[PDB]
Nucleic acid binder design. Structure first.
Ligand SMILES: Nc1ccn([C@H]2C[C@H](O)[C@@H](COP(=O)(O)OP(=O)(O)OP(=O)(O)O)O2)c(=O)n1
Ligand SMILES: *CC[C@H](OP(*)(=O)O)[C@H](O)COP(=O)(O)O
Ligand SMILES: [Mg+2]
Ligand SMILES: [Mg+2]
Ligand SMILES: [Mg+2]
Ligand SMILES: [Mg+2]
Ligand SMILES: [Mg+2]
Ligand SMILES: [Mg+2]
Length: 321
DNA sequence: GTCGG
DNA sequence: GCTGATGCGCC
DNA sequence: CCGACGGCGCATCAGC
């Protein structure tokens, strides 16, 4: 809301750099800038003001001055007017089509949903499912539906083994009134950092009751697929579901990772590296002079990882952009 | 694109 | 098959 | 052409 013009402009630029330029570090720079501006508790009145925030430099300050003066950005007007850029940006919205595949498609004259549907022979299984549920996957999930989904997943997991614990993470755990998809963190006492089909049994039970409808990818620790709520005698949209099986003794690094947000995580890990540590979904470690990280540090809470880095604990609701 | 070694 | 790199993706 | 930028799972491909 506050500074929404500016954060929309920077997000649109980020998406162009990732999807069209294939410049992931410019995507991240624009996202980091939009994130810090979104948290700033004042209406920005100049680029000079904004330049004082970490991750805003000369170039973004100039773009903020243009936007504040005119209510638009000439660079974005030109991007929006380029059919090629617009086609490439559009195809990346398809699950399984990234910047490289999108550019290949558009170079071969595939520029629309109709072109993709006429050229399904050119798509892999992941892209075919992304195409089938394209409209469904653009939609967000109201928290009321996330609650029903939580209730099916937790009930079916308990039926496979009462010792599993399933935790719905991502935007849901941050308290969002709607979610892009469902993220489930799974633990079982039989899988720790010390000893080793725990994920498979859960996926199979959710397929058997027809909640999971399609598989995009599946290994020993990560499931990526599609699910659907049962409906009365209009169907619910198909939804994306992610399931991550994490070592039970690494639950807190796991839940911290899977709660996000994404920008919160990259910011928190970048701030660990400047403070001499490395954080992944499993552990927090101190860095050696040799480049090789040391032994996993003891962790009894999410707060304990904040502490090692000297951060005020943020409740999950305070980890959103 | 920005920051920092 | 491997390693290593890329492409898709997850926060 | 200053390099780093968060860290990693799964699927595939290149070059063995
Ligand atoms: N803040 C910066 C700017 C540049 N460089 C890189 C790119 C430069 O090409 C290189 C050093 O070469 P220069 O001749 O530009 O640096 P000098 O300090 O020698 O230049 P000057 O004569 O302006 O002092 O370091 C860097 O590491 N950090
Ligand atoms: C936003 C302006 C650009 O900053 P970055 O190094 O992406 C450049 O300064 C000018 O590039 P252009 O926007 O392509 O002209
Ligand atoms: Mg880049
Ligand atoms: Mg700054
Ligand atoms: Mg995509
Ligand atoms: Mg591209
Ligand atoms: Mg999510
Ligand atoms: Mg580890």
């Amino acid at each position: 809301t506050l500074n929404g013009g500016i954060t929309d402009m920077l997000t649109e630029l980020a998406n162009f750099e990732k999807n069209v330029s294939q410049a992931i570090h410019k995507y991240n720079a624009y996202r980091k800038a939009a994130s810090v501006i979104a948290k700033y508790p004042h209406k920005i009145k100049s680029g000079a003001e904004a330049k004082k925030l970490p991750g805003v430099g000369t170039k973004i300050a100039e773009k903020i001055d243009e936007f504040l003066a005119t209510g638009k950005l000439r660079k974005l007007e030109k991007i929006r007017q380029d059919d090629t850029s617009s086609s490439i940006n559009f195809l990346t919205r398809v699950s399984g089509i990234g910047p490289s595949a999108a550019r290949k498609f558009v170079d071969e004259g595939i520029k629309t949903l109709e072109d993709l549907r006429k050229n399904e022979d050119k798509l892999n299984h992941h892209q075919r499912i992304g195409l089938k549920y394209f409209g469904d996957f653009e939609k967000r999930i109201p928290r009321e539906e996330m609650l029903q989904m939580q209730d099916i997943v937790l009930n079916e997991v308990k039926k496979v083994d009462s010792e599993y614990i399933a935790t719905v993470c991502g935007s849901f755990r941050r308290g969002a009134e709607s979610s892009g998809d469902m993220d489930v963190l799974l633990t079982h006492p039989s899988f720790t950092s010390e000893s080793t089909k725990l994920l498979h049994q859960v996926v199979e039970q959710l397929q058997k009751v027809h909640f999971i409808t399609d598989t995009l990818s599946k290994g020993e620790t990560k499931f990526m697929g599609v699910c659907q709520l049962p409906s009365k005698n209009k169907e619910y949209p198909h939804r994306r579901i992610d399931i991550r099986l994490i070592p039970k003794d690494q639950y807190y690094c796991g839940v911290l990772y899977f709660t996000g947000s994404d920008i919160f995580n990259k910011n928190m890990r970048a701030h660990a590296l400047e403070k001499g540590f490395t954080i992944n979904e499993y552990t927090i470690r101190p860095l050696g002079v040799t480049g090789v990280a040391g032994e996993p540090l003891p962790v009894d809470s999410e707060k304990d990882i904040f502490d090692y880095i000297q951060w005020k604990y943020r409740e999950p609701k305070d980890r959103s952009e």
